[PDB]
């Protein structure tokens, strides 16, 4: 069912995450962590304090799909065991130094062809698939986007609800 999912998404904020490679999204699914560039790190830290839930919606660039979505469970933190991100050109380990803990809500894919009816008011009402890493997605668009994903029956949202 979808009731606990809707409860988690109630009054949530949503951010598009654009990863350069599949490797880091796979690492994030395995370890429950994400790192972004400093401009987006600051925005996500502000949002984490401001809302009941901050949702990251992941898309690997050129994949034509979203790969899932997750909820921040922490602000970014440094000094952990370095996460072995595969680095794009021009991107360094120091830039990805801040580590967010995340709880996955859906690890299933959604093709862009299935979200073509959803536009994001915070990006000039372009299709929600369009946006830079870190682009915020307005509440209604983001809620409907998350509800389009196939159900992930491996996930139990009971523990996530109690973190809100």
Ligand X SMILES: CNc1nc(Cl)nc2[nH]cnc12
Whether residue 34 is annotated as binding a ligand: the answer is yes
Residue with tokens 């984490």: 48
Instruction: Please choose, out of 20-28, 98-106, 107-115, 145-153, the segment that lies near ligand X by the rule CB under 6 A.
Output: 20-28
Token pair of 145 as six digits: 């986007």
Q: Indicate the residue whose CB is closest to ligand X.
A: 20
Q: Please identify which residue in 15, 85, 100, 104 interacts with ligand X, judged by CB under 6 A.
A: 85
Q: Please identify which residue in 4, 7, 21, 97 interacts with ligand X, judged by CB under 6 A.
A: 21
| Centroid of chain to Cα 81 | 22
Binding flag, residue 133, ligand X (CB under 6 A) = yes
Binding flag, residue 36, ligand X (CB under 6 A) = yes
Residue closer to ligand X by CB (options 60, 105) is 60
Rounded Cα gap, residues 131 and 19, in angstroms: 12
> Among residue numbers 140 through 159, which ones bind ligand X (CB under 6 A)?
none
Token pair of 142 as six digits: 């983001």
What backbone phi and psi angles, to 5 degrees, belong to 16? -75, 130
- Residue-wise burial string across 95-122, b where 16 or more C-beta atoms lie within 10 A, e elsewhere: ebbbbbbbbbbbbebbeeebbeebebeb
Whether residue 20 is annotated as binding a ligand: the answer is yes
Whether residue 122 is annotated as binding a ligand: the answer is no
> Among residue numbers 93 through 112, which ones bind ligand X (CB under 6 A)?
96
Token pair of 161 as six digits: 């609800």
Q: Which residues are annotated as a binding site?
A: 18-20, 34-35, 85, 133
Residues that bind ligand X (CB under 6 A): 18-21, 24, 35-37, 85, 88, 96, 133
């Amino acid at each position: 069912g979808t009731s606990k999912l809707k409860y988690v998404l109630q009054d949530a904020r949503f951010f598009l995450i654009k990863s350069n490679n599949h490797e880091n999204v796979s690492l994030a699914k395995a370890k429950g962590v994400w790192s972004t560039l400093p401009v987006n790190e600051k925005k996500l830290n502000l949002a984490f304090r401001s809302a009941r839930s901050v949702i990251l919606i992941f898309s690997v660039r050129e994949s034509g799909k979203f790969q899932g979505f997750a909820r921040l469970s922490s602000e970014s933190h440094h000094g952990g065991s370095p996460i072995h991100w595969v680095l794009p050109a021009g991107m360094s380990a120091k830039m990805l130094g801040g580590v967010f803990k995340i709880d996955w809500i859906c690890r299933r894919e959604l093709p862009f062809t299935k979200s073509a009816h959803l536009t994001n008011p915070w990006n000039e009402h372009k299709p929600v698939k369009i946006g830079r890493d870190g682009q915020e997605i307005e509440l209604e668009c983001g809620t409907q986007l998350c509800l389009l994903f196939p159900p992930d029956e491996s996930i139990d949202l009971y523990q996530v609800i109690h973190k809100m």
